[PDB]
Amino acid sequence: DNQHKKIKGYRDLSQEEIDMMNRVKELGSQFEKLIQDVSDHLRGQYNASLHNRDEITRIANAEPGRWLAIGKTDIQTGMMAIIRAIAQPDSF
Amino acid sequence: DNQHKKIKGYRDLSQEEIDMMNRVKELGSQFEKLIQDVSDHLRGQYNASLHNRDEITRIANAEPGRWLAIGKTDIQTGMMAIIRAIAQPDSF
Amino acid sequence: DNQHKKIKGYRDLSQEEIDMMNRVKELGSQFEKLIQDVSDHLRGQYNASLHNRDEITRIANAEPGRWLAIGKTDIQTGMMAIIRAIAQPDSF
Amino acid sequence: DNQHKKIKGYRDLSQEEIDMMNRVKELGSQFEKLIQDVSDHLRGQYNASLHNRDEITRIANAEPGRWLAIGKTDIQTGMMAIIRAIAQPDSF
Amino acid sequence: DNQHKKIKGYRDLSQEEIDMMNRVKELGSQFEKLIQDVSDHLRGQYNASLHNRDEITRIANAEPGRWLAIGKTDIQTGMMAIIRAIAQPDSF
Amino acid sequence: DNQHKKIKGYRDLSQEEIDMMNRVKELGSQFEKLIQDVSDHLRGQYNASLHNRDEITRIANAEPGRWLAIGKTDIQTGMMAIIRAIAQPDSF
Ligand SMILES: Nc1nc2c(ncn2[C@@H]2O[C@@H]3COP(=O)(O)O[C@H]4[C@@H](O)[C@H](n5cnc6c(N)ncnc65)O[C@@H]4COP(=O)(O)O[C@H]3[C@H]2O)c(=O)[nH]1
Ligand SMILES: Nc1nc2c(ncn2[C@@H]2O[C@@H]3COP(=O)(O)O[C@H]4[C@@H](O)[C@H](n5cnc6c(N)ncnc65)O[C@@H]4COP(=O)(O)O[C@H]3[C@H]2O)c(=O)[nH]1
Ligand SMILES: Nc1nc2c(ncn2[C@@H]2O[C@@H]3COP(=O)(O)O[C@H]4[C@@H](O)[C@H](n5cnc6c(N)ncnc65)O[C@@H]4COP(=O)(O)O[C@H]3[C@H]2O)c(=O)[nH]1
Questions:
Q1: By CA distance, what is F88's nearest residue in E?
Q2: Chain C CB within 8 Å of residue A12 CB
Q3: Which phi and psi (to 5°) does residue A3 adopt?
Q4: How far apart are the C-alpha atoms of B32 and B54, rounded to whole Å?
């Protein structure tokens, strides 16, 4: 009960701050959907290019799944940074 | 004219790929609006806490504007990574 | 009251998870002290090298305050990542 | 012998600078221990939640091992940035 | 045809800007070669240290392939940032 | 004298490893030159667009100097990661 009071640096948040944080998280939800769509596109592209050594080598050299993972991580950590700017913890 | 053909590694893009890229960029637009809103909130919070040395010191110690900048950069570079996964350049 | 229940993706945490999170944050406190010490060292180094154009140019070219800021940000975001691994939010 | 004189940009370091660098590295050691502890916790959590499809899916969706790896990398690169601020190499 | 006009925020580029971008990309090519060389060195080091449990454990603990991957990603995203500074898109 | 033996985790390096590290650093030197060139281009672009409120606002909105700084930091930390993969320190 009231676990946030037990975590160092966590202060009480107004409803306004909570709403802004939840807004960040909902925009992140939309980004989650978009990333899933891109991953599906990559599956389909690779599949359709099966037994096309040149196209398969092109895709493998571009490393699109690795770049999608990088982008996902950047989106999530940017979300976390914005939420930190809103919530403003009391600790380093 | 057709400048993309003059840049190393840039290949021709299908309309599908262009649409996915533009989708990433529009979601980024919404994030731009959200970040502007958070910055306005920070302006108002600081202003309202003028001549409240304790609250001013708290805000300054939390560094919310620096964290908002960090989050903005992360969102933008994640956008760039996702767009790279879609467009798949031909170069390192 | 119980603000964590109002934030999307935040689940109830056991006392064990809270303790691990607080541990991350206390180690971060020690890092805060170390970074303050390094910043003091940089102040003193610059001051002692006043009116020594060569040493001043060397320091300015090395950009140690910018690198200290980079390191601080990395430590803080790594702390945030570890705390996320512990708390395991329910959202993207 | 004296390999640091053979590496571009590496200058001679005072004992004070070496001590500060070693301090950064020892704090990093403590972080290494903490990360090992968190990884053990994750092993135990997953194991205890074996044959609990809902809890297993929750953990898998949270990706805590990936976030622990992200945090480890951030801690290490922040350490490297702080050590660079101390040692101040002579090269880009 | 003229796909860049269909992507949000992409403006027309002068030949000067295109040349600077291509310069960034060619320097990146040289970095690609250097990273391949380092990876070959790591293969050879590991191979030569086969059936030397101590050296194998040392290498595994240092995680040099993971650090090479980190460095590759940093080089590529720095390239992307510089190219963005040159091309200056019109969108967030 | 032999300061590297006094820093935790630093092992003795072969001449091969030193040469690879110095190679990374020389490529970084070339990147330093390229970044200086881009910064000069940005100075000239801004200057030439003086008293052209529209072009000045465009440049300011694109934030090219901030993106150049981001790219510089990424190049430098990628260099550091590659050099770490080569030198392979003995510490976290
Ligand atoms: N005004 C303008 N800006 C441009 C243009 N092309 C790129 N940019 C900018 O520079 C970045 C490109 O960096 P990059 O070449 O290292 O990575 C690019 C490149 O790898 C890929 N890409 C872009 N256009 C492509 C294309 N036409 N074909 C193939 N891949 C392409 O998408 C990546 C991310 O694009 P982005 O829109 O997020 O960032 C742009 C964008 O901010 C351009 O034509 N005009
Ligand atoms: N003052 C204050 N600041 C808070 C509070 N909750 C979060 N913050 C701050 O914003 C960050 C949360 O960002 P996030 O929601 O994107 O990631 C959070 C979230 O994914 C997770 N987490 C935090 N509280 C949780 C909880 N109660 N349940 C589940 N997961 C939780 O831990 C991550 C990192 O926490 P952190 O302490 O390093 O950074 C906080 C912290 O700096 C809060 O209640 N009060
Ligand atoms: N002037 C000066 N600067 C130094 C010296 N040693 C390191 N630095 C600087 O601090 C960084 C070292 O941080 P680190 O100890 O966390 O990571 C180091 C360390 O993990 C590894 N390394 C460096 N010298 C080593 C060595 N002698 N043996 C083994 N590993 C070594 O290389 C990493 C990256 O080196 P770098 O040259 O890119 O950055 C240096 C460099 O900018 C040094 O002797 N003199």
A1: E62
A2: yes
A3: -65, -30
A4: 31
Which of A19, B63, F20 is closest to E37 using CA atoms?
F20
Contact D77, F77 (CB under 8 A): yes
Residue A10: which region, alpha, beta or left (left: phi > 0; alpha: psi -120 to 50)? beta
Closest listed residue to residue A45, CA positions, set B85, B90, B28: B85
First to last CA, chain C: 25
Q: Is C80 in the pocket of ligand 2 (CB under 6 A)?
A: yes
Q: 3-class SS at B74? A: helix
Which chain B residues have a beta carbon less than 8 Å from that of A77? 71, 74
Distance CA A83, CA B31 (A): 13
Q: Tell whether D83 is covered by a domain.
A: yes
Question: Is residue A7 in a domain?
Answer: no
Residue A72 lies in a domain: yes
Domain extent, residue D27, equals 15-87
Ligand 3 mean position to E69 CA, how many Å?
A: 18
Flag whether B10 is marked binding. Answer: yes
Among B9, B85, A66, smallest CA distance to E73 is for A66
PDB resolution in Å: 2.4
Nearest to C30 by CA among F92, D31, A8, F8: D31
**Number of domains within chain D:** 1
The pair of structure tokens assigned to F61 is 């909105």
Is residue B58 within 8 A of residue A90, CB to CB? The reply is yes
Cβ atoms of F72 and F35 within 8 Å: the answer is: yes
Cβ atoms of residues F68 and F35 within 8 Å: yes
- CA-nearest of F27, F52, B17, F65 to E84 is F65
Cβ(D86)–Cβ(C39) below 8 Å: no
- Cβ B80 under 6 angstroms from ligand 1: yes
Cβ–ligand 3 distance for F81 under 6 Å, the answer no
Side-chain-facing half-sphere of B1: CA atoms under 13 Å: 1
B31 touches E at CB < 8 Å? yes
Give the dihedral sign, CA D8/D14/D17/D21: positive
| Cα(B3)–Cα(E3) distance, integer angstroms | 9
- Please tell me the experimental approach by which this structure was elucidated: X-ray
Amino acid of residue D33: K
Q: Is B4 in the pocket of ligand 1 (CB under 6 A)?
A: yes
Distance between CA atoms of residues D42 and D48, nearest Å: 10
Cα distance between residue C19 and residue D34, in whole Å: 12
Per the domain annotation, does B48 fall within a domain? yes
d(CA B44, CA B29): 23
Q: Which of F8, F84, F86 to mutate to test the pocket of ligand 3 (most atoms within 8 A of CB)?
A: F84
Q: Give the separation between CA A28 and CA B60, rounded to whole angstroms.
A: 27
Beta-carbon separation of B38 and A85 below 8 A: yes
